[PDB]
Amino acid sequence: MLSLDQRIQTLAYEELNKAVEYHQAKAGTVVVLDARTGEILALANTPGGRNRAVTDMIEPGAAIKPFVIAKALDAGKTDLNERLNTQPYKIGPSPVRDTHVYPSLDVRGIMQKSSNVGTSKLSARFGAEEMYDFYHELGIGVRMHSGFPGETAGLLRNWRRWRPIEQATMSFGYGLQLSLLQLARAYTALTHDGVLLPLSFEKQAVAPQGKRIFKESTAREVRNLMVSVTEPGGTGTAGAVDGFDVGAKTGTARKFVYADNKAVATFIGFAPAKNPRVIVAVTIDEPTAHGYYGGVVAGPPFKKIMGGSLNILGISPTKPLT
């Protein structure tokens, strides 16, 4: 009747509490979607006061980067061969920096290493109004109308109020806010070959009519780029799943005072990367023990939830098991 798959939800709820307790976090959330139909297979929240996946508005941090890269590729403002100067720079007083000083990176490196500089430079190739409409067409600031009271629209500030630094920080996930469900929805544009899905709490006999945001070719090429995140040399190797190519993104969103230690560890990805079937999104709110970063904190729960979901759904491994 409903789209909930109890086998996946119980797996997700248990793996979530495991991670939340181990790292002594304030809260956590997991979303599992059918990557081809948008059916919500699992929605787990801890300490399960409210449905945080739908209600809690967060700055996504680095999790939004693949959409800026996809947009730059879709419109032809960059390509897969271009190497971008990724030295840290400033816009007036405000700095734009990565964790490491990379002299140059292509779009694959920007995804792989999670480069704020590279992503902001690609975004700066669009006008403020262009990015505003892009973010709004991704559903940022658009209510899900899931039915749960306390649902949030999200925050997308009017483009006319954007300072140049603010457009830059939005490109790597600060200055706009959305729920984990909204963020998981947006990734259907990458898995469903450029077509954004509306999501559904009930079973779907066929994928509903979505809305195209990217060319099919753009979505496929971006998916390949994101597999470098879980492969050695990427920030999300802790989310690799045995027997699959996993395209994913990690982020450590910082919170208001931006604090250097209070942060929401995020890990979101899909598999099988080339022909995705499952989206898994994990957020761990304010971990205080055994790590800080989305990769190390939310990676392991993603790994087990993704691998179990693929197994539960009977998805054949693409590579030999180890």
Residue 215's Cα: distance from chain center in Å? 19
Q: By CB neighbour count within 10 A (0-12 exposed, 13-18 middle, 19+ buried), where does 75 fall?
A: middle
- Domain total of the chain: 1
Which ranges constitute the DSSP H helices of the chain? 6-23, 52-55, 65-74, 107-113, 116-123, 128-137, 164-171, 180-186, 188-191, 216-227, 294-312
Resolution in A: 2.2
What Rg, from alpha-carbon coordinates, does the chain have? 18
15 CB-near residues (< 8 Å, 6+ apart): 30, 301, 304, 305
Q: Are 186 and 204 in contact (CB under 8 A)?
A: no
Interatomic CA distance for residues 128 and 112, integer angstroms = 26
136 CB-near residues (< 8 Å, 6+ apart): 142, 156
At 250, which amino acid appears?
A: T
Tokens 């999104």, residue? 281
- How many other C-beta atoms can be found within 10 angstroms of the C-beta atom of residue 321? 7
8 CB-near residues (< 8 Å, 6+ apart): 32, 41, 42, 305, 308, 309, 312
298 CB-near residues (< 8 Å, 6+ apart): 19, 250, 265, 266, 267, 282, 283, 284
| Alpha-carbon distance values, 182 to 123, 130, 138, 179, 229 (Å) | 21, 20, 9, 5, 22
At 272, which amino acid appears?
A: P
Backbone angles phi, psi at 98, to 5 degrees: -105, 170
Tokens 């395209």, residue? 247
The neighbouring-strand residues paired with 212 are: 195
Whether the upstream peptide bond of residue 300 has omega within 30° of 0, thus cis, is: no
| Alpha-carbon distance values, 60 to 2, 77, 274 (Å) | 28, 24, 25
Which residue range forms the structural domain that includes residue 138? 1-322
Q: Are 72 and 64 in contact (CB under 8 A)?
A: no
